[PDB]
């Protein structure tokens, strides 16, 4: 249908090639489905900025602005898990 | 359009009648009277308004009680 | 066609100023006043609309019969059957687990 302007085709020709390309990556992630961490169904969809609701599974999860989990919050979860193990074991 | 045209939308009263002085000087949004200086306990009078003093003061009304006390 | 007028003195199409134009005797049409559409009861946990309770205005629930504003079950009218069924299993299974885990394991 379109060569390379896939989702930012709604913007027409009026915001600059680079700005349309930067927002294209974010809008694809913002409107995509994600695997539910509790029921493993590809059904998590954003409702508001930072709120992700799992449709066929009935869970409301706080996450990133445009993705279910940020890379910064992914390391923090692993950092806290490692720190808790050290505290629990000596 | 600042002349004839803009006067068409004048259908909201800034002032209504005052309970204490009887003049259409009660500002609705300010909740006070511009003439008698309502809820303020003292009646509003100014020395630069010498005519406004002789328009509403002692003796400009009925003097229902004071007309008898002084003559007595 | 026959054109109508408001009967009350509300001249604006607000939410409480809904009307229905119905035909009357002699071919003339009269103006009614229609009620607002109301929501129903929701489970306190899952937020789902409860069955067996009508979606009417809050003051109209008093006029209903006693059995028409609730369901003959525990937490009837405030919790769904799924909401209640998990409450029963949570209550029994946690207490049973505590009985063996602690309390003379």
């Amino acid at each position: 249908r379109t060569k390379k302007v896939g989702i930012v085709g709604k913007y027409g020709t009026r915001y600059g090639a680079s700005l349309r390309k930067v927002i294209k990556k974010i809008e694809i992630a913002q409107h995509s489905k994600y695997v539910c961490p509790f029921c493993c169904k590809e059904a998590v969809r954003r409702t508001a900025c930072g709120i992700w609701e799992c449709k066929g599974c009935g869970k409301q999860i706080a996450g990133g602005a445009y993705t279910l989990s940020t890379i910064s919050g992914a390391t923090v979860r692993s950092t806290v898990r490692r720190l808790r193990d050290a505290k629990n074991s000596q | 359009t600042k002349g004839t045209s803009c006067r068409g939308t004048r259908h909201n009263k800034t002032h209504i009648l005052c309970k204490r002085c009887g003049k259409r000087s009660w500002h609705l949004q300010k909740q006070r009277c511009a003439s008698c200086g309502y809820p303020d306990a003292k009646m509003r009078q100014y020395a630069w308004g010498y005519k406004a003093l002789r328009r509403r003061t002692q003796g400009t009304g009925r003097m229902r009680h004071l007309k008898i006390a002084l003559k007595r | 066609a026959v054109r109508v007028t408001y009967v009350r003195k509300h001249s604006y199409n607000t939410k409480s100023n809904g009307i229905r134009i119905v035909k009357t005797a002699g071919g003339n049409m009269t103006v009614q006043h229609r009620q607002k559409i109301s929501n129903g009861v929701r489970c306190g946990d899952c937020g789902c609309v409860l069955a067996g309770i009508r979606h009417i205005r809050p003051h109209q629930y008093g006029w209903l019969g006693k059995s028409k504003r609730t369901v003959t079950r525990a937490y009837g009218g405030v919790k769904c059957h799924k909401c209640v069924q998990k409450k029963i299993l949570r209550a029994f299974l946690i207490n049973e687990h505590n009985l063996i885990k602690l309390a003379a394991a």
């Binding site: 913007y11 915001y15 700005l19 930067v22 927002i23 974010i26 961490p37 509790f38 409702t47 508001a48 900025c49 930072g50 709120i51 869970k59 409301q60 999860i61 706080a62 996450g63 990133g64 602005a65 445009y66 993705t67 989990s69 940020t70 910064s72 919050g73 923090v76 979860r77 950092t79 806290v80 720190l83 808790r84 050290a86 505290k87 | - | -």
Partner: protein, 246 residues
């Protein structure tokens, strides 16, 4: 001359916060015995969008420690919190995401958020989207700990200052390019009146200190002292450096 827009902002008439649809004040619960010496459990009932702020808010329900009833709270949601989760607040709380612990119980290197500046003041630092503070070091001699603020500055706090373990949800909000003036207009729907900013050079000499003449230019240095009076303090104040840094 006239009064600049920065001066008119301090009277707060049309510049008051548009805080009508806000959920409430987001903070920890008031500190009591059961959280100084024990732990309380709170259920995350729902996660909501607080107007005017980028991070989601959690409606946590602690039962009650002393009376009969409920204690409905309103936390700033940490990333990874979900509905129906059990979170714990107290000194002996486990080191899990979403729990509220005294800052002295967190090991060095722990990532926390909604930290208290003064104990019992219900959270000050690390409250915006994706923001956090890191525990640097502890000091048991005077019962104090060091944390790293999101701006990079280090702060020394009492060891019993409370914070929530994890990242504030909603990170990456500012990485999406606003494209339209309309979107920026809607961004301040539940905020103050600031958005359409007229440049000072585009004004007249009465309106602004930058109000120029026949050519749109400032005319005098834009770096000013901190002691400049209001109405002339326009531009960069106490600027140590200036320009595209290298």
């Amino acid at each position: 001359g006239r009064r600049t827009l920065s001066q008119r902002k301090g009277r707060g008439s049309i510049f008051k916060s548009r805080s009508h649809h806000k959920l409430g004040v987001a903070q920890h619960r008031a500190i009591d015995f059961f959280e100084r010496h024990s732990t309380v459990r709170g259920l995350v009932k729902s996660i909501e969008h607080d107007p005017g702020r980028g991070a989601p808010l959690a409606r946590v329900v602690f039962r009650n420690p002393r009376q009969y009833g409920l204690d409905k709270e309103l936390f700033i949601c940490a990333e990874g919190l979900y509905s129906g989760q059990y979170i714990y607040c107290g000194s002996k709380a486990s080191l899990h995401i979403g729990n509220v612990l005294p800052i002295g119980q967190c090991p060095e290197g722990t990532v926390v958020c909604n930290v208290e500046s003064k104990p019992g003041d219900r959270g000050i630092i690390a409250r915006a989207s994706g923001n956090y503070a890191t525990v640097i070091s502890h000091n048991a001699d005077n019962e104090t700990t060091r944390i790293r603020l999101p701006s990079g500055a280090k702060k020394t706090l009492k060891s019993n200052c409370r914070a929530m373990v994890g990242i504030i949800a909603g990170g990456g909000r500012t990485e999406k390019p606003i494209l339209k003036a309309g979107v920026a207009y809607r961004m301040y729907k539940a905020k103050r009146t600031t958005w359409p900013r007229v440049r000072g050079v585009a004004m007249n000499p009465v309106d602004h200190p930058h109000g120029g003449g026949n050519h749109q230019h400032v005319g005098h240095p834009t770096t000013l002292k901190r002691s400049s009076p209001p109405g002339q303090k326009a531009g960069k104040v106490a600027a140590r450096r200036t320009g595209l840094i290298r």
